[PDB]
């Protein structure tokens, strides 16, 4: 049982490394888009020096109701990952229950 | 044991009728031989039995044979010493016993009675041309599913039930369904179970296993297959349990 | 053993005193019996000992009984050979003793002295009538925590400490605090290494274990409880550890 467990966890280590590398490859796939987007955005910010009356996605004029969105890892045994994530989430929602934010 | 054999051998040599001798704890026929062989002057063998363990055991077991005048079917309740399945007393009787059936404390501690092991219990009557082709195929599929479960017992116990595949998870749930469905309410074990006994034939258990491992009814709860006579009684117990859940 | 035991029983039966006999290495007595009975022609027995390995040492132990005149509290440092408790020479002593404390080599390999294994260490005096429901209940709770830790040690095997949920994580933190606290610098282990010895009383250690099991001491690290006396001194050691960083 211990030898088969060792073989299985070695297989999961190899598969997890390949999955990490394929996620990195997806990020490098995305980096053309992100670079072109982060340069066109500056091109807009240079043609107009934030001369704007627009974009309802820039209403930071209060902190009335925050929506902390927490992504987490979704499998079994999850390293030591999911507990750390939701722990920081619980600390942050506690701090947002202090201020009275009514967080979703 | 030789007295039982002499009565059976008379009923097979003279009365020309097929007899069914049940010997209980044939391991006593070897252990008493041990206790006398120690004093007798014969040297001790392996773990503590007599030297002529095999020849004495054969002198009992060989006289039980269908001999053209009848047929002595026999079911010896061999005792494995503390489940030492490699000990001389069962190791010599495995050679003589045709349709052996290894009952396991491992599959009894979880309450699955009878404690017969699905894997270890094997018979030389599971050849297809002898037992029926569909029955042989169902037996092969059940044994393979239980073997896959016994091989995934290490992954399940340590790395969690979720860390395996989602087809292999179907095989695990199917193996659970099977290894619970092959429980039986005996008529004589009603005092231990508390529930009445259901005698179920061969074709009915084949028709049950076909629908269980064909994936057609993988929705029933696991306890609905526990201590149940037939697959129709399992379907009825699923309704009973779903009503008792909300009620 | 017989001559020292006669020397003690003369005091317990004629002078009426509460004499002690710290008979050391009972196993050496049984092994001497093994030698002499391998040479005395007596037929061999279990693994190597004399056939009379349960009557000769019976003549040792059963003469150590507290009579109505005086009482004797013998402390017999019986030795398990090759570090297995199934052996017959200590197995026949387990049945005679009543407050057996198994000094398993595990906690000494971990550096926790004394290495008295809290699960194997057991006594017929851990009863409600004898020690009071207070000390008995705390003993039951600490044995509970340590047993839960030892049974999930099979998971603190191949996997890591993280895979435990919050329940098992808290009980492991508490069990580590306890199995560290069960160490003590002896008053005679000033020679080897460590602090001068600290005499810890029953009504004093009961406070420490009530405090640890009550959860009010989660702030302290593990190397703070190690090799300390009372619980106030444990908190002092933690504070000084934080000052020395």
XYZ file of C-alpha atoms in Angstrom:
596
model
C 0.000 0.000 0.000
C 2.798 2.443 0.846
C 4.692 1.609 -2.348
C 1.574 2.062 -4.486
C 0.866 5.314 -2.634
C 4.406 6.466 -3.395
C 3.928 5.666 -7.085
C 0.568 7.454 -7.134
C 1.837 10.590 -5.402
C 4.841 10.680 -7.722
C 2.399 10.505 -10.634
C 0.343 13.318 -9.122
C 3.491 15.398 -8.628
C 4.395 14.947 -12.296
C 0.843 15.677 -13.493
C 0.602 18.733 -11.239
C 3.901 20.045 -12.594
C 2.670 19.560 -16.161
C -0.569 21.345 -15.270
C 1.347 24.245 -13.702
C 3.396 24.517 -16.880
C 0.299 24.423 -19.093
C -1.304 27.185 -17.018
C 1.900 29.178 -17.436
C 1.633 28.508 -21.172
C -1.923 29.846 -21.132
C -0.643 32.971 -19.366
C 2.064 33.394 -22.016
C -0.695 32.949 -24.592
C -2.526 35.804 -22.881
C 0.503 38.114 -22.573
C 0.195 39.461 -26.163
C -3.353 40.572 -25.386
C -2.393 42.037 -22.012
C 0.587 43.927 -23.445
C -1.445 45.357 -26.324
C -4.206 46.302 -23.887
C -1.859 47.976 -21.410
C -0.256 49.998 -24.217
C -3.514 51.059 -25.913
C -4.824 52.150 -22.512
C -1.822 54.442 -22.072
C -2.302 55.686 -25.637
C -5.818 56.730 -24.624
C -4.548 58.236 -21.366
C -2.031 60.267 -23.380
C -4.373 61.461 -26.124
C -6.748 62.547 -23.348
C -5.098 63.306 -19.987
C -8.017 61.730 -18.099
C -10.367 64.361 -19.539
C -13.548 62.388 -18.971
C -17.191 62.388 -18.004
C -17.904 58.674 -18.445
C -17.243 55.093 -17.245
C -19.605 54.149 -14.379
C -16.822 51.607 -13.639
C -14.907 54.397 -11.886
C -17.250 55.182 -8.977
C -14.812 54.971 -6.060
C -16.519 57.937 -4.388
C -17.410 55.836 -1.325
C -16.745 52.351 0.146
C -20.437 51.729 0.839
C -20.770 48.057 -0.188
C -17.718 45.985 -1.134
C -17.968 42.759 -3.140
C -14.951 40.714 -2.122
C -14.777 37.953 -4.725
C -12.668 35.008 -3.580
C -11.433 32.459 -6.092
C -10.217 29.205 -4.548
C -8.726 25.924 -5.690
C -11.234 23.227 -6.453
C -10.037 19.650 -5.889
C -9.199 17.284 -3.056
C -6.441 17.719 -0.470
C -5.702 21.154 -2.048
C -2.178 21.339 -0.586
C -2.480 23.889 2.206
C -4.217 26.256 -0.146
C -7.979 26.560 0.325
C -7.746 27.011 4.096
C -5.266 29.886 3.759
C -7.428 31.532 1.094
C -10.703 31.374 3.003
C -8.877 32.345 6.202
C -7.739 35.620 4.656
C -11.267 35.967 3.259
C -12.771 35.572 6.737
C -10.339 38.116 8.183
C -11.213 40.599 5.440
C -14.966 40.125 5.826
C -14.531 40.604 9.574
C -12.757 43.902 8.920
C -15.572 44.826 6.519
C -18.146 43.928 9.169
C -16.375 46.377 11.473
C -16.824 49.347 9.098
C -20.398 48.251 8.329
C -19.990 47.585 4.613
C -22.563 44.785 4.024
C -20.169 42.742 1.901
C -21.371 40.327 -0.774
C -13.876 -37.118 10.994
C -13.099 -40.676 9.948
C -16.334 -41.804 11.605
C -18.322 -39.326 9.509
C -16.338 -40.500 6.486
C -17.154 -44.127 7.251
C -20.880 -43.432 7.452
C -20.751 -41.424 4.217
C -18.602 -44.041 2.485
C -21.112 -46.714 3.426
C -23.948 -44.579 2.067
C -21.948 -44.090 -1.138
C -20.678 -47.659 -1.552
C -23.790 -49.674 -0.661
C -26.919 -47.515 -0.503
C -26.094 -45.960 -3.906
C -27.295 -42.505 -2.864
C -25.538 -39.147 -3.121
C -24.846 -37.917 0.414
C -23.972 -34.476 1.764
C -21.522 -34.634 4.675
C -20.877 -31.421 6.585
C -17.666 -31.560 8.588
C -17.340 -28.606 10.922
C -13.858 -27.353 11.773
C -11.774 -29.879 9.853
C -8.819 -27.996 11.334
C -9.499 -29.886 14.561
C -8.742 -33.105 12.661
C -5.234 -31.686 12.226
C -4.781 -29.969 15.581
C -5.718 -33.079 17.574
C -3.255 -34.926 15.374
C -0.723 -32.325 16.488
C -1.445 -32.798 20.200
C -1.042 -36.553 19.865
C 1.961 -36.454 17.515
C 3.878 -34.317 19.996
C 3.673 -37.045 22.645
C 3.832 -39.941 20.171
C 7.530 -39.455 19.434
C 7.144 -37.969 15.964
C 9.278 -34.890 15.426
C 7.573 -31.484 15.193
C 7.025 -30.036 11.724
C 6.544 -26.377 10.816
C 4.700 -23.898 12.957
C 3.666 -26.641 15.421
C 1.569 -29.240 13.620
C 2.286 -32.925 13.161
C 4.845 -34.120 10.577
C 2.285 -36.153 8.614
C -0.115 -33.241 8.359
C -0.533 -33.562 4.604
C -0.857 -37.350 4.434
C -3.377 -37.448 7.291
C -5.361 -34.564 5.804
C -5.330 -36.414 2.492
C -6.372 -39.633 4.217
C -9.497 -37.766 5.256
C -10.137 -35.655 2.164
C -9.459 -38.216 -0.584
C -12.125 -40.631 0.638
C -14.687 -37.948 -0.282
C -15.168 -38.543 -4.013
C -18.029 -39.246 -6.396
C -17.290 -42.866 -7.221
C -19.835 -44.010 -9.884
C -22.144 -45.394 -7.165
C -23.168 -41.970 -5.881
C -21.683 -38.578 -5.075
C -20.412 -37.404 -1.677
C -20.766 -33.667 -1.862
C -19.058 -32.249 1.208
C -18.612 -28.834 2.801
C -15.747 -28.775 5.316
C -15.725 -25.663 7.499
C -11.944 -25.363 7.512
C -10.616 -23.165 10.305
C -7.816 -20.808 9.314
C -5.658 -20.398 12.445
C -6.016 -16.689 13.249
C -6.505 -16.064 9.497
C -2.987 -17.347 8.804
C -4.031 -18.209 5.251
C -0.490 -19.538 4.674
C -0.453 -21.898 7.666
C 0.043 -25.622 6.933
C -3.450 -26.635 8.061
C -5.285 -24.564 5.413
C -2.380 -24.712 2.952
C -2.740 -28.480 2.676
C -6.533 -28.343 2.435
C -6.593 -25.768 -0.359
C -5.082 -28.450 -2.605
C -7.915 -30.892 -1.847
C -10.844 -28.461 -1.723
C -12.471 -27.825 -5.107
C -14.845 -24.897 -4.514
C -12.986 -23.137 -1.723
C -14.615 -20.124 -0.057
C -12.358 -17.916 2.072
C -14.430 -15.967 4.590
C -12.665 -12.836 5.825
C -12.733 -10.993 9.136
C -11.918 -7.864 7.132
C -15.281 -7.962 5.368
C -17.018 -8.871 8.637
C -15.705 -6.028 10.799
C -17.691 -3.679 8.563
C -20.763 -5.865 9.049
C -21.118 -7.326 5.548
C -22.438 -10.766 6.335
C -21.773 -13.444 5.161
C -18.101 -12.557 5.529
C -17.201 -14.406 2.336
C -14.462 -12.630 0.429
C -15.567 -11.858 -3.145
C -11.992 -12.147 -4.410
C -10.379 -14.933 -2.379
C -13.374 -17.270 -2.574
C -12.832 -18.991 -5.918
C -14.057 -22.223 -7.467
C -13.037 -24.425 -10.369
C -16.720 -24.471 -11.329
C -16.434 -20.888 -12.578
C -15.367 -22.187 -15.961
C -17.790 -20.792 -18.556
C -18.821 -23.950 -20.417
C -19.687 -25.461 -17.033
C -21.437 -22.580 -15.271
C -23.151 -20.683 -18.093
C -21.684 -17.923 -20.238
C -23.627 -14.938 -18.898
C -23.158 -16.119 -15.310
C -19.419 -16.468 -15.925
C -19.259 -12.977 -17.408
C -21.134 -11.465 -14.459
C -18.839 -13.276 -12.021
C -15.773 -11.990 -13.878
C -17.092 -8.421 -13.866
C -17.984 -8.563 -10.161
C -14.580 -9.968 -9.218
C -12.828 -7.357 -11.363
C -14.821 -4.513 -9.813
C -14.008 -5.776 -6.320
C -10.338 -6.123 -7.268
C -10.326 -2.532 -8.518
C -11.882 -1.466 -5.217
C -9.277 -3.389 -3.221
C -6.563 -1.688 -5.269
C -8.136 1.748 -4.712
C -8.499 1.117 -0.968
C -5.061 2.694 -0.471
C -5.826 5.829 -2.498
C -9.266 6.230 -0.906
C -8.040 5.768 2.667
C -5.163 8.255 2.412
C -5.663 10.792 -0.368
C -9.428 11.169 0.012
C -12.308 9.737 -2.004
C -12.222 12.712 -4.377
C -8.605 12.497 -5.542
C -9.346 9.702 -8.032
C -11.063 9.799 -11.420
C -14.765 10.286 -12.092
C -15.104 7.022 -13.973
C -13.075 5.250 -11.293
C -15.390 6.903 -8.773
C -18.282 5.221 -10.567
C -16.378 1.939 -10.287
C -15.839 2.559 -6.558
C -19.518 3.275 -5.913
C -20.418 0.254 -8.055
C -18.030 -1.928 -6.050
C -19.631 -0.677 -2.849
C -23.079 -1.487 -4.230
C -21.929 -4.970 -5.254
C -20.067 -5.865 -2.059
C -23.076 -4.781 -0.023
C -25.603 -6.491 -2.305
C -23.801 -9.793 -1.808
C -25.020 -9.769 1.792
C -27.693 -12.246 2.724
C -30.311 -12.576 5.449
C -29.986 -16.222 6.447
C -32.858 -18.137 7.996
C -30.570 -19.329 10.806
C -28.883 -15.926 11.201
C -32.140 -14.138 12.023
C -31.210 -14.188 15.717
C -28.086 -12.171 14.911
C -29.652 -9.842 12.332
C -33.077 -9.379 13.899
C -34.608 -9.311 10.378
C -36.213 -12.297 8.607
C -34.263 -14.305 6.073
C -34.675 -14.262 2.297
C -33.598 -17.278 0.245
C -32.645 -16.065 -3.239
C -31.865 -18.247 -6.230
C -29.011 -18.142 -8.708
C -30.729 -16.566 -11.722
C -32.179 -13.855 -9.477
C -28.772 -12.789 -8.169
C -27.411 -12.798 -11.724
C -30.278 -10.563 -12.848
C -29.585 -8.340 -9.854
C -25.865 -7.972 -10.508
C -26.500 -7.268 -14.203
C -28.580 -4.205 -13.338
C -26.255 -3.169 -10.505
C -23.002 -3.129 -12.472
C -24.589 -2.122 -15.787
C -24.844 1.411 -14.372
C -28.627 1.431 -14.779
C -29.378 1.904 -11.072
C -26.404 3.774 -9.588
C -28.772 6.219 -7.847
C -29.958 4.110 -4.899
C -28.335 4.797 -1.510
C -25.637 2.384 -0.381
C -27.653 1.161 2.606
C -30.493 0.185 0.264
C -28.324 -2.703 -0.945
C -27.394 -3.879 2.549
C -28.776 -7.162 3.921
C -31.300 -7.589 1.127
C -32.645 -10.726 -0.521
C -33.173 -9.637 -4.121
C -32.738 -6.544 -6.273
C -36.490 -5.917 -6.134
C -36.320 -5.920 -2.339
C -33.417 -3.483 -2.688
C -35.574 -1.216 -4.852
C -38.311 -1.401 -2.208
C -35.828 -0.608 0.565
C -34.699 2.445 -1.400
C -38.279 3.748 -1.285
C -38.517 2.901 2.420
C -35.278 4.769 3.132
C -36.206 7.814 1.047
C -39.485 8.058 2.956
C -37.783 7.581 6.334
C -35.223 10.266 5.441
C -37.779 13.073 5.231
C -40.147 11.504 7.774
C 16.166 -9.559 44.491
C 15.372 -12.150 47.140
C 18.023 -10.956 49.585
C 17.207 -7.252 49.226
C 13.545 -8.173 49.488
C 14.147 -10.088 52.711
C 16.127 -7.104 53.992
C 13.113 -4.885 53.300
C 10.448 -7.264 54.588
C 12.233 -7.647 57.915
C 11.744 -3.908 58.385
C 8.145 -4.010 57.171
C 7.190 -6.945 59.395
C 9.225 -6.529 62.608
C 9.864 -2.788 62.942
C 6.635 -1.583 61.243
C 8.078 0.980 58.847
C 7.073 2.218 55.392
C 10.245 1.005 53.739
C 10.896 1.276 49.999
C 12.886 -1.123 47.842
C 13.947 0.339 44.492
C 14.741 -3.038 42.963
C 16.602 -2.177 39.779
C 16.359 -4.244 36.574
C 13.904 -6.983 37.454
C 14.630 -8.253 33.935
C 18.203 -8.955 34.995
C 16.833 -11.261 37.682
C 14.696 -13.111 35.116
C 17.610 -13.290 32.675
C 19.859 -14.688 35.411
C 17.151 -17.280 35.904
C 17.365 -17.898 32.157
C 21.106 -18.550 32.371
C 20.939 -20.810 35.408
C 18.017 -22.830 34.046
C 19.671 -23.195 30.658
C 22.565 -24.690 32.622
C 20.461 -26.422 35.312
C 19.088 -28.893 32.771
C 15.560 -27.497 33.090
C 13.832 -27.680 29.731
C 13.731 -24.446 27.682
C 10.598 -22.306 27.540
C 9.304 -19.277 25.656
C 11.767 -17.405 23.679
C 14.731 -18.134 25.954
C 13.697 -18.037 29.586
C 13.345 -20.657 32.284
C 10.130 -22.696 32.368
C 9.490 -21.230 35.831
C 9.490 -17.641 34.588
C 6.056 -17.032 36.156
C 6.658 -18.663 39.559
C 10.218 -17.559 40.339
C 9.406 -13.931 39.604
C 6.149 -14.629 41.403
C 8.273 -15.432 44.442
C 9.875 -12.054 43.873
C 6.760 -9.929 43.380
C 4.223 -11.599 45.671
C 6.522 -11.234 48.660
C 6.293 -7.472 48.039
C 2.835 -6.931 49.547
C 1.750 -4.232 51.972
C 0.820 -6.063 55.166
C -1.518 -4.730 57.843
C 1.521 -3.766 59.928
C 3.601 -1.876 57.368
C 3.528 -1.071 53.668
C 6.291 -1.263 51.054
C 6.264 0.725 47.814
C 8.745 -1.079 45.573
C 9.782 0.642 42.353
C 10.956 -2.082 39.982
C 12.792 -0.822 36.891
C 11.844 -3.886 34.863
C 13.537 -3.870 31.453
C 11.800 -4.868 28.236
C 14.408 -6.574 26.033
C 14.875 -5.435 22.429
C 12.194 -2.780 23.107
C 9.059 -4.889 22.598
C 6.407 -5.232 25.295
C 5.116 -8.597 24.041
C 8.194 -10.323 25.489
C 7.369 -12.810 28.282
C 9.916 -11.551 30.826
C 8.206 -8.145 31.133
C 4.808 -9.556 30.137
C 4.737 -11.607 33.333
C 5.660 -8.462 35.261
C 2.843 -6.396 33.756
C 0.341 -8.718 35.433
C 2.006 -8.266 38.822
C 2.558 -4.509 38.764
C -0.238 -2.008 39.345
C 1.150 1.401 38.290
C 3.181 0.366 35.240
C 4.750 3.282 33.350
C 6.282 2.298 30.009
C 9.321 4.458 29.210
C 9.055 4.019 25.460
C 12.177 4.980 23.527
C 10.118 7.089 21.104
C 9.814 10.173 23.285
C 13.502 9.914 24.182
C 14.438 9.743 20.509
C 12.378 12.925 20.212
C 14.289 14.377 23.176
C 11.355 14.454 25.616
C 12.743 13.350 28.962
C 11.280 11.551 30.824
C 10.059 9.446 27.920
C 7.109 8.037 29.863
C 4.735 7.165 27.048
C 1.393 8.652 28.152
C -0.766 6.090 26.345
C 1.058 2.968 27.548
C 1.630 4.389 31.030
C -1.316 3.270 33.145
C -2.246 2.636 36.759
C -4.970 0.938 38.760
C -5.053 4.113 40.879
C -6.568 6.191 38.054
C -9.961 5.632 39.664
C -12.624 8.107 40.846
C -12.484 7.122 44.523
C -8.703 7.482 44.816
C -7.732 10.732 43.120
C -11.012 12.627 43.072
C -13.150 13.315 40.032
C -11.089 16.440 39.268
C -7.704 14.800 38.702
C -9.334 11.711 37.192
C -11.284 13.800 34.677
C -8.185 15.746 33.657
C -6.228 12.502 33.274
C -9.010 11.164 31.054
C -9.028 14.336 28.958
C -5.253 14.348 28.453
C -5.225 10.659 27.553
C -8.054 11.443 25.115
C -6.072 14.203 23.409
C -2.918 12.083 23.232
C -4.790 9.041 21.920
C -6.452 11.098 19.196
C -3.019 12.425 18.253
C -1.485 8.946 18.141
C -4.320 7.595 16.000
C -4.097 10.439 13.496
C -0.315 10.053 13.439
C -1.117 7.651 10.593
C -2.259 10.752 8.674
C 0.598 12.943 9.950
C 2.383 10.159 8.105
C 2.475 10.142 4.294
C 0.375 13.329 3.966
C 1.267 16.596 5.767
C 0.059 18.403 8.862
C -1.987 20.764 6.675
C -4.438 18.135 5.418
C -6.148 18.014 8.807
C -9.286 20.085 9.216
C -9.539 22.700 11.963
C -10.671 20.079 14.495
C -7.686 17.781 14.008
C -5.365 20.785 13.709
C -6.455 22.153 17.087
C -6.237 18.753 18.767
C -2.753 18.260 17.285
C -1.599 21.651 18.566
C -2.976 20.814 22.009
C -1.450 17.323 21.928
C 1.951 18.720 20.991
C 1.682 21.231 23.836
C 0.850 18.372 26.210
C 3.484 15.881 25.049
C 6.028 18.679 25.339
C 4.778 19.671 28.798
C 5.137 16.090 30.051
C 8.911 16.640 30.043
C 10.663 17.874 33.178
C 14.271 18.682 34.130
C 14.915 16.145 36.881
C 16.586 16.970 40.166
C 19.112 14.242 39.305
C 19.436 15.130 35.603
C 21.406 18.252 36.490
C 24.440 16.195 35.476
C 23.565 15.341 31.875
C 22.156 18.628 30.530
C 19.626 21.268 31.466
C 18.224 23.280 34.337
C 18.357 22.390 38.026
C 15.460 20.140 38.885
C 11.949 21.365 39.658
C 9.660 19.490 42.046
C 6.153 19.577 40.538
C 3.196 18.705 42.738
C -0.087 17.001 41.913
C -2.336 19.942 42.802
C 0.146 22.091 40.863
C 0.385 20.085 37.625
C -3.398 19.695 37.635
C -3.537 23.475 37.190
C -1.148 23.339 34.244
C -3.103 20.630 32.472
C -6.451 22.303 33.180
C -4.973 25.477 31.684
C -3.599 23.766 28.572
C -6.782 21.785 27.916
C -8.975 24.822 28.619
C -7.648 26.449 25.441
C -6.529 29.628 27.232
C -2.874 29.032 26.233
C -2.907 28.866 22.429
C -0.531 31.834 22.193
C 2.523 29.953 23.447
C 4.873 28.192 21.005
C 5.935 24.588 21.410
C 9.530 25.042 22.598
C 8.165 27.161 25.454
C 6.523 24.271 27.313
C 9.470 21.939 26.713
C 11.616 21.103 29.759
C 9.791 23.403 32.169
C 8.153 22.993 35.545
C 4.876 24.591 36.560
C 2.567 26.322 34.100
C 3.408 29.802 35.397
C 7.055 28.975 34.732
C 6.016 27.751 31.279
C 4.450 31.135 30.525
C 7.576 32.800 31.940
C 9.751 30.683 29.636
C 7.559 31.695 26.689
C 7.868 35.383 27.573
C 11.651 35.125 27.917
C 11.773 33.204 24.625
C 9.973 36.106 22.961
C 12.352 38.621 24.557
C 15.425 36.685 23.403
C 13.634 36.245 20.026
